[PDB]
């Protein structure tokens, strides 16, 4: 969450695969009364102010991006999530059908809305996860161990402001991350889980195993072999919603020279991944907020994937060209140089 923007994904909707993915996702969300395509196209700022719309739109965009990448034959060797988007990881690993992921996102957003919990917000400061907890004021807990210098704290808005003032008294880098009036990964989530768990158990029918490529980020490393982490069932999603995020603890396991792709409408975690990763990793954004034309950025991402040794063919994206080619196609033999 936190990577949405006005009219995101409109440029990528011109491609056939992305549009088909969006149409399938909308058909999945049709019964409940919101259409993803209209949300994307609409321009009123209130469209993304809501939470359910933001969640559904982000999940749909990520699923469409994964479909575009899969159209080129790419299959990941690892997977990582961050707060929401663990569902996108589920789709990427085959552990959840498209309808399953979209419905899970929508129901998360719907349950969070109806909860009627008090106001909340998140602020991430330079304090380290290990040391922040001791230095954190009562009633506020570490939210996301993003990196050795970035950590998020969730809780009541007023305590967040007071601790932000205290920290700026120290001069540290503190900012209330865009949370939309609600703070996640805290005790506030304690009440939401039960109804959410029952709803999800209603939604997902047959829990399926989580492959070894997926590296969880809600269940600590000590229990990756535990029972809960074995299968991505409503229990896993509820735990992801409730507990904090061990994102930094998950990036150590990226083998050197690994190419990392940021499947997200906006590459917010690019800066975090640049310092949390090894010195020889390659990071590709795949999208930028308020870009002139996102298709060009995506194509540049695929080209930069090409430069890194990963062979991805861009022909699969566009409609095929019938053959034999028209008479007069430029000769290719002269171009080959040794």
Question: How far, in Å, CA of 279 to CA of 152, rounded?
Answer: 24
Q: Output the known binding site for an acyl-CoA.
A: 149-150, 173, 275
Q: How was this structure determined?
A: cryo-EM
Catalytic residue among 21, 25, 54, 83: 83
First to last CA, the chain: 50
**CB < 8 Å & 24+ apart, contacts of 308-311:** 308/259, 308/282, 309/259, 310/74, 310/259
Strand arrangement of the beta sheet that strand 151-155 belongs to: 141-144, 151-155, 121-125, 174-177
CB-CB contact of 119 with 100 (8 Å)? no
Bind-site residues: 149-150, 173, 275
Residues in the chain: 338
Q: Å resolution of this model?
A: 3.3
Alpha-helical regions (H) of 74-209:
86-92, 98-115, 129-135, 157-170, 189-203
User: How many C-alpha atoms does 186 have within 13 Å on its Cβ side?
Assistant: 24
Alpha-carbon distance 276 to 150, whole Å? 10
Of 104, 175, 170, which is closest to residue 146 (Cα–Cα)?
175
- For residues 89 and 81, the answer to whether their CB atoms sit within 8 Å is yes
Distance CA 251, CA 54 (A): 26
Cα–Cα dist 110/180, whole Å: 15
Is 280 marked active-site? no
């Amino acid at each position: 969450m936190g990577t949405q923007w006005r009219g995101m994904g409109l440029s990528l909707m011109r491609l056939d695969r992305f549009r088909d993915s969006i149409l399938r996702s909308d058909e999945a969300v049709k019964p409940f009364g919101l259409k993803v395509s209209q949300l994307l196209l609409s321009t009123d700022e209130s469209t993304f102010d809501d939470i359910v719309h933001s969640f559904v739109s982000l999940t749909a965009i990520q699923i469409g991006l994964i479909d575009l990448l899969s159209c080129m034959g790419l299959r990941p060797d690892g997977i990582v999530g961050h707060s929401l988007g663990e569902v996108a990881c589920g789709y990427a690993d085959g552990c959840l059908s498209q309808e399953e992921a979209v419905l899970a996102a929508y129901w998360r957003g719907q349950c969070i809305k109806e909860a009627h919990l008090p106001p909340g917000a998140m602020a991430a400061v330079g304090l380290s996860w290990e040391e922040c907890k001791q230095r954190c004021p009562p009633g506020v807990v570490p939210a996301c161990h993003n990196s050795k210098d970035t950590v998020t704290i969730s809780g009541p808005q007023a305590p967040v402001f007071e601790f932000v003032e205290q920290l700026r008294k120290e001069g540290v880098f503190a900012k209330e991350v865009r949370t939309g009036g609600m703070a996640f990964h805290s005790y506030f989530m304690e009440a939401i889980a039960p109804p959410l768990l029952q709803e999800l158990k209603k939604v997902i029918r047959e829990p399926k195993p989580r492959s070894a490529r997926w590296l969880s980020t809600s269940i600590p490393e000590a229990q990756w072999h535990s029972s809960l982490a074995r299968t991505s069932s409503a229990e896993y999603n509820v735990n992801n919603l409730v507990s904090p995020v061990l994102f930094q603890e998950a990036l150590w396991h990226v083998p050197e020279h690994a190419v990392v792709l940021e499947i997200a409408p906006h590459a917010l975690l690019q800066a975090v991944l640049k310092r949390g990763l090894k010195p020889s990793c390659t990071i590709i954004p795949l999208m930028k907020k308020d870009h002139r034309d996102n298709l060009e950025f995506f194509l540049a991402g695929i080209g930069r994937l090409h430069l890194s040794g990963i062979d991805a063919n861009p022909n699969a994206l566009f409609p095929p060209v019938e053959f034999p080619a028209p008479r007069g196609t430029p000769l290719i033999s002269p171009l080959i140089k040794w």
